[PDB]
Design a binder for this molecule. Structure first.
Ligand SMILES: *C[C@@](*)(O)[C@H](CCCNC(N)=[NH2+])NC(=O)[C@@H]1CCCN1C(=O)[C@H](N)Cc1ccccc1
Ligand SMILES: *[C@@H]1O[C@H](CO)[C@@H](O)[C@H](O)[C@H]1NC(C)=O
Ligand SMILES: [K+]
Ligand code: NA
Lengths: 34, 258
DNA sequence: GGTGGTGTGGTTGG
């Protein structure tokens, strides 16, 4: 059984959950255009 | 990790350290995918050619970490393993096809600011993001350079390392290496002419190649650090287990019991 | 120290 965690998976308490971007996540997103 | 940099605090709360009970040594990385399941690479646990065949009792996992060696009191959580499941068609004779394993914890772990699972991909996410030129992120406490030959620099990092690397087109991957590649793998790294660098290295195996979905803001594990030739050489690329293509198995194991 | 040391904060006590 998977167990707990999924509904909230991939959302980082100290970043997404506080509307904070880490220093380089933006470099990823910009790679996804074209 | 070669030419990454220090991770920020809580930047990958799904990073797991796979740790040998005795002698005490960091073996590999891994990822937390739920409160009781950890994903890693099969060759971390089982690689006969190097006489390696770990059982559950040999091993611990350490979650929430940042520092490579210090026990981080009130942050990290150490868990014992109940069961190890290696892909039944993991190909250790030849090219590490299907370099993946699941590890079930004896006791579900509590989440915290430093401990939080990552998502497994679905068909749409895989289809949107798994493309040449798109960048993912790799993390680990593995080597900072090629340690098996004299090189200047420290071997290992004091803290968790991160690098962001572009997925590479399959035919380039193919021609970069004499090792047989399969669709259970993909490769990532900068071309020589791109003049930016970076790579996973020995010790980073099992660690996650993740991508952030611009549609829902969530981090998804697209890959597992599997193999390479050298670290961060011009014209070579790190290879990663293709998580999504192995999803069916992942799910079959994870959902098998209540 | 127990787990380092630009040591009693820090990503956490005393
Ligand atoms: C177990 C992991 O720490 C490590 C990952 C190295 C990733 N390298 C780069 N450049 N990103 N994996 C290995 O060391 C694997 C395990 C067995 C040997 N190996 C290799 O990557 C060899 N260097 C190449 C190879 C040999 C046999 C089968 C497949 C690949
Ligand atoms: C690994 O070791 C176990 C014993 O714990 C053994 O029964 C199993 O066959 C081993 N597999 C290989 C390929 O060595
Ligand atoms: K201290
Ligand atoms: Na390279």
């Amino acid at each position: 059984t998977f167990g707990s965690g999924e509904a909230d998976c991939g959302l980082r308490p100290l970043f997404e959950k506080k509307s904070l971007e880490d220093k380089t996540e933006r470099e990823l997103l910009e790679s996804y255009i074209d | 990790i070669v030419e990454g940099s220090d991770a920020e605090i809580g930047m990958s709360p799904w990073q797991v350290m796979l740790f040998r009970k005795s002698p005490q040594e960091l073996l590999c990385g891994a990822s937390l995918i739920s409160d009781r399941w950890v994903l890693t690479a099969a060759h971390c646990l089982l690689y006969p050619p190097w006489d390696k065949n770990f059982t559950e009792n040999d091993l611990l996992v350490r979650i929430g970490k940042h520092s490579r060696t210090r026990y981080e009191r009130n942050i990290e959580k150490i868990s014992m393993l109940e069961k190890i499941y290696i892909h039944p068609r993991y190909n250790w004779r030849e090219n590490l096809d299907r370099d993946i394993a699941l590890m079930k914890l004896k006791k579900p772990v509590a989440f915290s600011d430093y401990i939080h699972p990552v998502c497994l991909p679905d068909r749409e996410t895989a289809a949107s993001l798994l493309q040449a030129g798109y960048k993912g992120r790799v993390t680990g406490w593995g080597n900072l350079k090629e340690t098996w030959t004299a090189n200047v620099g420290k071997g290992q990092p004091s803290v968790l390392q991160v690098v962001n690397l572009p997925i590479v087109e399959r035919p380039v991957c193919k021609d970069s290496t004499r090792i047989r590649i399969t669709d259970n793998m993909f490769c990532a790294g900068y071309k020589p002419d791109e003049g930016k660098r970076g790579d996973a290295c020995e010790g980073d195996s099992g660690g996650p190649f993740v991508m952030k979905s611009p549609f829902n803001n969530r981090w998804y594990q697209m890959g597992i650090v599997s193999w390479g030739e050298g670290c961060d050489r011009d014209g070579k690329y790190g290879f990663y287990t293709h998580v999504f293509r192995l999803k069916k198995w992942i799910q079959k194991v994870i959902d098998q019991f209540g």
